[PDB]
Amino acid sequence: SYNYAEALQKAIYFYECQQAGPLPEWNRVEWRGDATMNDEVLGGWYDAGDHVKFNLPMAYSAAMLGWALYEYGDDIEASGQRLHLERNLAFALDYLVACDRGDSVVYQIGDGAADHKWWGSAEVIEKEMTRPYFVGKGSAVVGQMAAALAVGSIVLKNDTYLRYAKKYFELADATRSDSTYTAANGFYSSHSGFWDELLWASTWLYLATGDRNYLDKAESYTPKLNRQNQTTDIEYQWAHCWDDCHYGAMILLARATGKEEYHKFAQMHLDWWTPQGYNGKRVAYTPGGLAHLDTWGPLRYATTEAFLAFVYADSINDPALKQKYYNFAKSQIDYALGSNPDNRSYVVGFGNNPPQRPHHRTAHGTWLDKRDIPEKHRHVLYGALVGGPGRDDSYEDNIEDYVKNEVACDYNAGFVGALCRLTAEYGGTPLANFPPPEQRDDEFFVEAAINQASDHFTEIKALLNNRSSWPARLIKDLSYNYYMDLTEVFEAGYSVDDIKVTIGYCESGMDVEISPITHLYDNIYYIKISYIDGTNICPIGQEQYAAELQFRIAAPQGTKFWDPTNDFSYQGLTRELAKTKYMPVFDGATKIFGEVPGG
Amino acid sequence: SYNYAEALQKAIYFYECQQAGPLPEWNRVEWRGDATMNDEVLGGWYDAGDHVKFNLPMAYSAAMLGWALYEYGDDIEASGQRLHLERNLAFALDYLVACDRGDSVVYQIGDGAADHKWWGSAEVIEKEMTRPYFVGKGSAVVGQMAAALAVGSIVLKNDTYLRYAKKYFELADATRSDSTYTAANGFYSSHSGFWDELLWASTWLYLATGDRNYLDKAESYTPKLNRQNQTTDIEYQWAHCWDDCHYGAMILLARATGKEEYHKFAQMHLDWWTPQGYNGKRVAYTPGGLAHLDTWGPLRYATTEAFLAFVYADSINDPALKQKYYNFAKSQIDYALGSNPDNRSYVVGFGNNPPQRPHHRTAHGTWLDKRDIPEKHRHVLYGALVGGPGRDDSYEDNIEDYVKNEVACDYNAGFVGALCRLTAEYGGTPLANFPPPEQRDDEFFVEAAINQASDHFTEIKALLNNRSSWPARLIKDLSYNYYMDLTEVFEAGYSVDDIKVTIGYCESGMDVEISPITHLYDNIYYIKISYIDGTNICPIGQEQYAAELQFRIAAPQGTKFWDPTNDFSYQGLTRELAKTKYMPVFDGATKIFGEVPGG
Ligand SMILES: OC[C@H]1O[C@@H](O[C@H]2[C@H](O)[C@@H](O)[C@H](O[C@H]3[C@H](O)[C@@H](O)[C@H](O)O[C@@H]3CO)O[C@@H]2CO)[C@H](O)[C@@H](O)[C@@H]1O
Ligand SMILES: OC[C@H]1O[C@@H](O[C@H]2[C@H](O)[C@@H](O)[C@H](O[C@H]3[C@H](O)[C@@H](O)[C@H](O)O[C@@H]3CO)O[C@@H]2CO)[C@H](O)[C@@H](O)[C@@H]1O
Ligand SMILES: OC[C@H]1O[C@@H](O[C@H]2[C@H](O)[C@@H](O)[C@H](O)O[C@@H]2CO)[C@H](O)[C@@H](O)[C@@H]1O
Ligand SMILES: OC[C@H]1O[C@@H](O[C@H]2[C@H](O)[C@@H](O)[C@H](O)O[C@@H]2CO)[C@H](O)[C@@H](O)[C@@H]1O
Ligand SMILES: [Br-]
Ligand SMILES: [Br-]
Ligand SMILES: [Br-]
Ligand SMILES: [Br-]
Numbered sequence A, B: 001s002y003n004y005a006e007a008l009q010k011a012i013y014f015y016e017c018q019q020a021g022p023l024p025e026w027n028r029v030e031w032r033g034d035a036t037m038n039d040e041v042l043g044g045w046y047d048a049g050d051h052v053k054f055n056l057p058m059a060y061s062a063a064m065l066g067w068a069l070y071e072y073g074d075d076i077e078a079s080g081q082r083l084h085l086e087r088n089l090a091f092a093l094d095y096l097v098a099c100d101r102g103d104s105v106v107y108q109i110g111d112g113a114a115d116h117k118w119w120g121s122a123e124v125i126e127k128e129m130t131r132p133y134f135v136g137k138g139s140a141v142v143g144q145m146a147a148a149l150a151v152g153s154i155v156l157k158n159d160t161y162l163r164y165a166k167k168y169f170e171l172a173d174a175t176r177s178d179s180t181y182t183a184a185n186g187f188y189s190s191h192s193g194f195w196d197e198l199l200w201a202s203t204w205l206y207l208a209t210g211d212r213n214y215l216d217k218a219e220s221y222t223p224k225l226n227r228q229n230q231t232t233d234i235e236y237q238w239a240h241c242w243d244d245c246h247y248g249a250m251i252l253l254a255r256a257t258g259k260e261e262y263h264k265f266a267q268m269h270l271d272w273w274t275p276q277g278y279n280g281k282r283v284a285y286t287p288g289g290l291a292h293l294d295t296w297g298p299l300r301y302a303t304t305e306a307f308l309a310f311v312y313a314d315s316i317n318d319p320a321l322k323q324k325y326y327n328f329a330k331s332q333i334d335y336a337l338g339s340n341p342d343n344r345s346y347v348v349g350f351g352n353n354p355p356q357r358p359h360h361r362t363a364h365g366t367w368l369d370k371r372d373i374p375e376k377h378r379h380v381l382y383g384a385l386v387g388g389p390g391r392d393d394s395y396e397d398n399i400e401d402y403v404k405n406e407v408a409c410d411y412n413a414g415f416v417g418a419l420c421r422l423t424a425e426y427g428g429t430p431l432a433n434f435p436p437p438e439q440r441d442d443e444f445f446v447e448a449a450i451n452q453a454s455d456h457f458t459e460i461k462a463l464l465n466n467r468s469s470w471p472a473r474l475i476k477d478l479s480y481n482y483y484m485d486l487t488e489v490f491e492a493g494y495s496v497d498d499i500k501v502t503i504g505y506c507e508s509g510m511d512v513e514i515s516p517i518t519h520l521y522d523n524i525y526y527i528k529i530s531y532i533d534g535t536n537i538c539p540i541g542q543e544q545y546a547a548e549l550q551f552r553i554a555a556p557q558g559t560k561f562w563d564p565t566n567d568f569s570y571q572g573l574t575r576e577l578a579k580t581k582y583m584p585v586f587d588g589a590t591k592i593f594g595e596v597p598g599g
């Protein structure tokens, strides 16, 4: 089968890849640093392969993580993953508490259009754009926030989360309107309305407190749910998801009240997902056996359903129904992990032939605001469940396909609960030395070329690069040195002041200084090129990743002695721009790349 | 009717505006310097409003100026213009001799297509492009060169001119082909063929030598001349012009031999030009009275025929014919001078309401390869006869109209000879102080703007301009100074070494240095911006006429003393670029523009 413990390990790690700054000390991702530190609310998760904090799918995802712990936290101790899941969840819940603004909440950080227009790493995005925030009291988003904190308070034994959960619930339930929820439009619009979120939140508050007032509230919301088409049944032909949690709330109410109506719903809905269907009606299935709800993120929907199915089956006694729901659930998870017509994992860094080009900016690690360069991802986004194949099982691993190769908090969330269930049952041993170290590239370096050369001068075209990625970062006090040998000038009967330093081109907006020619030792001299605000050299675009200077060092015109062939920093240069080690880069007084004459 | 001596004075001065480098000592044009000094053959005239040396019209123009002297040289001594005409002619003839290559000649300098694509002054064109030369033995071009030298040898009493007239004629007569005359195609293509040039050259050689053999040659060419349409007559329904000199040749042979065939031709030809016409055939006439041969350079054709008409009338005795031809001649010239429906001169810088926007590069004096800027010409192209009006006497003085407002060597050539005839008869007094000095604008200067101001720095955007025009020219050792008062620095406890100079932008290809901050006197200091090869600041285009530099002069970050309001070079600067006199420009050690503190 699969190593379900390893899959869970990675599936949890994914959330560490998504953390906004400040990072917790326990963050295990070597290519992530503090990012978006000027955000109006710190911490929390970037939503997908972007850098927007969208509170609806964020809170949804945390609620699902808390649900996993609530069902199976004791059952996953063997795998060693319980503590990882717990602290990863607190990280998000802390963000939700931090969004509190009294009569409203911060519900979004980032303008989605502007965020999406740019391709580059989290840690440098503030060099590209200012990130706005948005405040309101939308019942769906605030209700999902309440739900997340309620389940959170239970599994994390935390009074503060419970107090915020109640506050948020009262706010959503007083407001009864999504009219102040605007900034997520077209990305995470409230399609189903807010009645499902009030149901889901009050259900979890009932589970957290035992106060039957919340049970009464919860049940009072079920006649407000959307109907299946034009019938009197509650809608069941869809998945538990970021926009609609009434599905799982009904399952939770089945077990807590034992009432018939909730079991009838549960089995109607779950039946529609199974290959056997509900009275001849069923979700689309690929020939390969994937329950395929929609073009967008079909694995997300099916793996979340596998979780609901495991929980409902674990909660009933009928062996026929248990087997049917268990076999549906395991079949969807196993599809995602490799049991499909291509025998390939749809989880990054897991299993056989996993996706290698997820639509994920920071894991990609470009310097150029381009998706095609670099042609391979510089980092491994371990654990990320991709969108998945089409209705016909077709799929290509292509960074451009944000439909099939998107990754997201909400994709991973229900998938994590399902993997908890499968680990509990089959165990497995998590990877010992995970995550292993990545192969790194040079991050700060000069590329140089002989721009023009004559028998009295050397002209150098120098581009000081910031292509950092481990993590992408900014360095203000950047400089580099050009080392020369003046033996031939002295031997011909000339001196240092016979040699003059000039500039032939200085890139606009890169405030720059060049030192006088300076003695190092013997006949070896150098100039330092210093950028006053080196942070403007950053991997955010075609123009910004490198600063260009053209400088000339010249002997008096007409003369013939100049010999650049013995100059340390001239070594290996051609007419073509290339990386060189012999023009070393410094951060303040510390050399960070290259070599120096002697030492 | 007009001050013909003044018109003649100016018409000759036009050729001095046309001269290529090296210019003779006696050149009277303040806005012309040595130009195109890298040409394969030096001297000669730029053809038109451009900078090509086109040997066919150049030599034709020379031959015509020679003819003027031949007929009316003694008669114009009263005008004071004989010497001026003679040395101007000698200038062009010297060029024709210098074109000798033995079995071939240089017949063109500059590529017409390449030259005409660019709009700027003669003296800076080598910064723009590299000029080719062309060699061949075209019978028309070699023949015309021979003719010019043959007449020149007479009027200037010069054995070398005769020697080369004979050389070129023998080459043109042995080759009998225009096949190697290709470089001027589309500009000065040989349309008529070469038989007319051989007839013209051999006629002038006969008049120079008295050698009967040249007469026999000349007469032997007459059967090869083009016919008039389908008929038996030699073509008569055009003008003597750069392409076809058989008209003047027949007039010369009429007088030399007295033969009836030549007299018959001349009268037929001249009748076709007169208002009475020739047996019902006539050149087009504008209602205002201009014989209008063609939309291109109509004044050129009419005024050349005025000269031929004067010469033929002065050579016969029939009183009716004399009066008919003289009336025709004087009426064409007077039209050009202002006897027209607009009562306006079509000679630049002469008479009432003359043209002010001729199609002439160097006279315009741009700095940025545009016709429309500056909107008034910087220089007065005295004496230039423009193309002239349309068929209905319409005309607008528009730089863009290269049909109506073109000027050229051949436009002025016949014209000069006709003005010689008129001043001979009516005299007139030439202008005593001609040419008077031009009003100049500033040529080298800084435009500056406050690029950014802060409580601890000044940042300047500075453009060092070369919009030279009197004459357009190149300066290598260009620099300018930025002056500051550092009183507030010292009063706050800081030193000169606490003030840092950086660069925020340096235009590509402009080798520049900036001095350390330098003491002038008291608490006045400066930095000198020096361009190592300032000849790259030149008025040849939008990028070239100025070098942009952004520099910053900064006290430490955090300090509050910096005060630009007492800095000499800050006076008057705003956030928009403007010329400033307080950032003086230097050529080497010489201040060429602006003011210095304490002076
Ligand atoms: O009407 C059918 C069901 O619709 C459900 O809402 C879905 C929207 O109709 C669907 O367009 C949307 O898709 C998202 C996708 O979830 C996300 O991963 C991607 O980035 O953006 C897509 C485009 O917006 O998904 C939602 C939720 O699945 C209702 O929730 C449900 O009640 C209704 O039956
Ligand atoms: O075909 C009739 C006559 O043509 C004469 O040639 C002229 C060309 O036909 C005409 O196109 C050319 O026009 C020049 C113009 O003179 C010049 O100022 C301008 O810059 O460019 C135009 C294109 O070259 O003029 C020539 C000369 O008049 C023949 O010489 C003549 O024999 C013939 O009957
Ligand atoms: O919203 C769908 C999808 O969009 C992704 O961004 C686009 C962006 O919309 C467009 O402006 C830019 O030109 O191309 C990018 C890359 O496709 C975004 O990256 C995804 O997160 C999102 O699912
Ligand atoms: O040959 C006709 C006429 O052309 C003029 O040059 C043009 C040039 O051909 C074109 O490339 C450019 O765009 O505009 C200029 C000005 O019209 C040339 O200046 C004349 O001397 C010439 O008679
Ligand atoms: Br609000
Ligand atoms: Br590993
Ligand atoms: Br080293
Ligand atoms: Br005057």
Ligand SMILES: [Br-]
Pocket: B492, B559, B560, B561
């Ligand atoms: Br201070």
Ligand SMILES: [Br-]
Pocket: B594, B595, B596, B598, B599
């Ligand atoms: Br002064």
Ligand SMILES: [Ca+2]
Pocket: A140, A190, A191, A192, A193, A194, A195, A196, A197, A243, A244, A245
């Ligand atoms: Ca909803």
Ligand SMILES: [Ca+2]
Pocket: A484, A485, A486, A487, A488, A562, A563, A564, A565, A566, A567
């Ligand atoms: Ca050396």
Ligand SMILES: [Ca+2]
Pocket: B140, B190, B191, B192, B193, B194, B195, B196, B197, B243, B244, B245
């Ligand atoms: Ca001809």
Ligand SMILES: [Ca+2]
Pocket: B484, B485, B486, B487, B488, B562, B563, B564, B565, B566, B567
């Ligand atoms: Ca000051």
Ligand SMILES: [Cl-]
Pocket: A348, A349, A355, A356, A357, A377, A379, A380, A381
């Ligand atoms: Cl990968």
Ligand SMILES: [Cl-]
Pocket: A373, A374, A375, A376
């Ligand atoms: Cl690559």
Ligand SMILES: [Cl-]
Pocket: B104, B135, B136, B137, B180
């Ligand atoms: Cl040849």
Ligand SMILES: [Cl-]
Pocket: B274, B275, B276, B277, B324
């Ligand atoms: Cl008449």
Ligand SMILES: [Cl-]
Pocket: B348, B349, B355, B356, B357, B377, B379, B380, B381
């Ligand atoms: Cl003028």
Ligand SMILES: [Cl-]
Pocket: B373, B374, B375, B376
């Ligand atoms: Cl102007």
